[PDB]
Design a binder for these strands. Structure first.
Ligand SMILES: Nc1ncnc2c1ncn2[C@H]1CC[C@@H](COP(=O)(O)OP(=O)(O)OP(=O)(O)O)O1
Ligand SMILES: [Mg+2]
Ligand SMILES: [Mg+2]
Ligand SMILES: [Mg+2]
Lengths: 105, 669
DNA sequence: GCCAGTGCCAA
DNA sequence: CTTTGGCACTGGC
């Protein structure tokens, strides 16, 4: 249910997907990243229809995050028509995420 | 005998004013101060002592006070002042001889807290005086509301300065007496503070005379400086910088950037358990924040990170990328870190062809940076040290090494890249007499380079004579010893043969020998027994050295050629101590005798004369010469002086030198 | 800016 | 157990 991005698939999968896309920049060695992970699996099917959940491991794909000024992880970027519409950094509980999404959708 | 010291407005290079001076006279036992307007009187007092056949003691006067007084006498009073070398004593030179096992701050040029071992108290005080004075000055200023500038404490004379001047002499006198109480260098039956100059030198250990002569001569060399081709180095720098950039571009293309944790202040604890996970990167839990276009959410933890670009000068980055490509380290350090030197890099193997080739780019990059650092960007770079006169005035501690060898710094002219190393031709060529134009004719000067032949192996011959009756001393003269060894060891170059034989002679293990010749430990064994069996007296000498020094120490010092005590650090490095010291003392008396003979022939030392010492690199001297004829005489004279030194100390092996004439160091060595 | 850890430049 | 030295460059506090 989740979209696993690569540096080379980012443009067409996110910047041109024209719709709501939540991107999560993460790394395996990050505690918080490991925390919000389970939350994202659930948000995925629950918003299946009004949103798309995509993940990009910054270690395997080192070229995308810098273009967005990543300063901490996990970084949550909600794109809309190829542009960032809202961002949040840190491991949010499922409750807070649902708020962020409903509020931005 | 008198003890003195002066205070002036700046370092020798730009000093223009005499602030004050103090003189303690042993015959009257009183201290006399000389303020700004007493400069003429101060000088008269010093010349008077010279007129009596007396002595003047300074602490570092050989390099500073004496030449500074000559300079200031001309500038301020238009007087000709030149204290004779035979009338001067230098407590710094003396302590460096007596306590050769200790380090010193080179008159505060070095950070004391950085030096290893202990420091002699009196000398420590002396070397720190300027820094202490500077502090008292700044303090007193802040107490009166004024702002402190650079080093204004030296711009004008003042009574605080005068008090420190007086304190220098009191401390210097105490240091002197302490040094003169060493029965080994100064016989107890003689009061050395109550005799004429000729007596002082003739009744003390030969070493006392040699060190003072070496210091006087080397101070002159520093003043001469080494003519430097600034333009050629600035162009070498441009060339190296472009190659560095291109290597960086290629490398940052092959080895991409990445992120790592940075800024974590909080500890990450498992949500369920709550146990600390100190291994996980430290995090941060924003206090304020909610769902508000702020990016953070109170209580929502994240890991602060930073983006890092590949740095070829980082052994860490290198190690990280190579392992990420399949590299499995074989050797680590006493800190867990894997060894990443050229020898290891040369042996690394990975699948990805591009990454494999990248290793060569990395080795080239490190080397390029090595040259840029020494020539232009480092704190001690040549381009940062060239003076207005177009010369680099490297500093020299005449007796800075425990063995009696000298040390070199600011910058270290005894570590210029060899002509056979990458970019060595250009580096070497930038140091040359040719870059100095005669003050009268405007014509370039010529360079004479002389180097002692197979120095330390001949010292081995000497000490092995009692065991082998001079066989080695004799066979070593049959053609070039290093070239002869190169052939027998089947080595690629003569340089490789030199580093091989000495490593061997000084205890290199089988593995180490293998490395040196570029092979394995087994090849190291072959060579080790091959040369050892070809000259068994080497073992005899080693055993004898051992039986004499070790019993726990039976005695922890060797007696040098001139009688001094030479501190031994390890039983295993004892032979090196014996031979390096002998070689160092031979070369020291050698450079002294060389100049003395040139002067006896009527030649004058100086740019406004006939020749000028530009550098002394252990067993090598590079001398600037006004003409080729003079260069020819310098070379011939240097050879005569060496034979003289060998005869002087009844050396059991004939001593030689090889000379070269040319425009620069690239050609003269 | 200070300092440990590494590693290279010379003899 | 090569030895004697100077010095640069990264990375941690
Ligand atoms: N790798 C080394 N290890 C230890 N000591 C060395 C080493 N290289 C040189 N030395 C010492 C011993 C010889 C002395 C002077 O060096 P130099 O290179 O002039 O040797 P050398 O005098 O034997 O050779 P040459 O006859 O070629 O001038 O410094
Ligand atoms: Mg002084
Ligand atoms: Mg030599
Ligand atoms: Mg030499």
């Amino acid at each position: 249910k989740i979209i696993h991005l690569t540096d080379d698939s980012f443009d067409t999968d996110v910047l041109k997907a024209d719709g709501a896309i939540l991107v999560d920049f993460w790394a395996e060695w990050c505690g918080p990243c490991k925390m919000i992970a389970p939350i994202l699996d659930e948000i995925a099917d629950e918003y299946q229809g009004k949103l798309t959940v995509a993940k990009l491991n910054i270690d395997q794909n080192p070229g995308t995050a810098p273009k967005y000024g990543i300063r901490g992880i996990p970084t949550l970027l909600l794109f809309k028509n190829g542009e960032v519409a809202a961002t949040k950094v840190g491991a949010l509980s499922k409750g807070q995420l649902k708020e962020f999404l409903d509020a931005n959708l | 005998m008198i003890v003195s010291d002066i205070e002036a407005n700046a370092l020798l290079e730009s000093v223009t004013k005499f602030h004050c001076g103090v003189i303690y006279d042993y015959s009257t036992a009183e201290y006399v101060s000389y303020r700004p307007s007493d400069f003429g009187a101060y000088l008269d007092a010093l010349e008077a002592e010279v007129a009596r056949g007396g002595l003047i003691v300074f602490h570092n006067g050989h390099k500073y006070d004496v030449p500074a007084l000559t300079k200031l006498a001309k500038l301020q009073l238009n007087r000709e002042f030149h204290l004779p070398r035979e009338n001067c004593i230098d407590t710094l030179v003396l302590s460096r001889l007596i306590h050769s096992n200790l380090k010193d701050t080179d008159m505060g040029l070095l950070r004391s807290g950085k030096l290893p071992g202990a420091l002699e108290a009196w000398g420590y005080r002396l070397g720190e005086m300027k820094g202490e004075y500077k502090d008292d000055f700044k303090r007193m200023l802040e107490e009166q509301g004024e702002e402190y500038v650079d080093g204004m404490e030296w711009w004008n004379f003042n009574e605080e300065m005068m008090d420190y001047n007086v304190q220098d002499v009191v401390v210097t006198k105490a240091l002197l007496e302490k040094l003169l109480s060493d029965k080994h260098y100064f016989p107890p039956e003689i009061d050395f503070t109550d005799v004429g100059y000729t007596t002082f030198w003739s009744e003390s250990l030969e070493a006392v005379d040699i060190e003072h002569r070496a210091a006087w001569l080397l101070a002159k060399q520093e003043r001469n400086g080494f003519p430097f081709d600034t333009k050629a180095i600035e162009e070498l720098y441009v060339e190296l910088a472009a190659r560095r950039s291109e290597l960086l571009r290629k490398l940052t293309e092959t080895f991409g950037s990445w992120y790592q944790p940075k800024g974590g202040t909080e500890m990450f604890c498992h949500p369920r358990t709550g146990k600390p996970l100190p291994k996980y990167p430290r995090i941060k839990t924003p206090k304020v924040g909610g769902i508000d276009t702020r990016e953070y959410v109170a209580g929502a933890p994240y890991t602060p990170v930073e983006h890092v670009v590949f740095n070829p000068s980082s052994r860490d980055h290198i190690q990280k990328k190579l392992q990420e490509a399949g590299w499995v380290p074989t050797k680590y350090t006493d800190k867990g870190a894997p060894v990443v030197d050229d020898e290891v890099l040369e042996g690394v193997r990975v699948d990805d062809p591009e990454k494999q080739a990248a290793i060569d780019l990395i080795k080239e990059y490190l080397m390029i940076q090595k040259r840029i650092g020494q020539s232009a960007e480092g704190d001690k770079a040549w381009l940062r040290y060239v003076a207005e006169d177009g010369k680099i005035h490297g500093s020299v501690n005449p007796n800075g090494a425990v063995t009696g060898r000298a040390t070199h710094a600011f910058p270290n002219l005894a570590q210029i890249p060899g002509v056979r190393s990458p970019y060595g031709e250009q580096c070497r060529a930038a140091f040359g007499a040719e870059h100095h134009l005669d003050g009268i004719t405007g014509k370039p000067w010529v360079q004479a380079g002389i180097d002692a032949s197979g120095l330390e192996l001949r010292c081995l011959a000497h000490f092995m004579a009692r065991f082998d009756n001079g066989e080695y001393a004799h066979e070593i003269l049959n053609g070039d010893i290093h070239t002869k060894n190169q052939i027998a060891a089947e080595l690629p170059t003569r340089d490789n043969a030199k580093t091989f034989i000495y490593g061997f002679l000084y205890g290199a293990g089988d593995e180490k020998i293998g490395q040196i010749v570029g092979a394995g430990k087994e090849r190291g064994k072959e060579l080790k027994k091959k040369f050892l069996e070809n000259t068994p007296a080497i073992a005899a000498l080693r055993e004898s050295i051992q039986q004499t020094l070790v019993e726990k120490w039976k005695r922890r010092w060797i007696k040098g050629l001139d009688g001094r005590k030479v501190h031994v650090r390890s039983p295993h490095a004892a032979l090196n101590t014996l031979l390096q010291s002998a070689g160092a003392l031979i070369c020291k008396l050698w450079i002294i005798k060389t100049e003395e003979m040139l002067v006896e022939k009527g030649l004058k030392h100086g740019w406004d004369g006939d020749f000028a010492y530009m550098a002394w690199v252990h067993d090598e001297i590079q001398v600037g010469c006004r003409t080729e004829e003079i260069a020819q005489v310098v070379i011939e004279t240097a050879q005569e002086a060496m034979r003289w030194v060998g005869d002087h100390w009844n050396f059991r092996c004939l001593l030689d030198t090889e000379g070269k004439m040319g425009p620069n160091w690239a050609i003269c060595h």
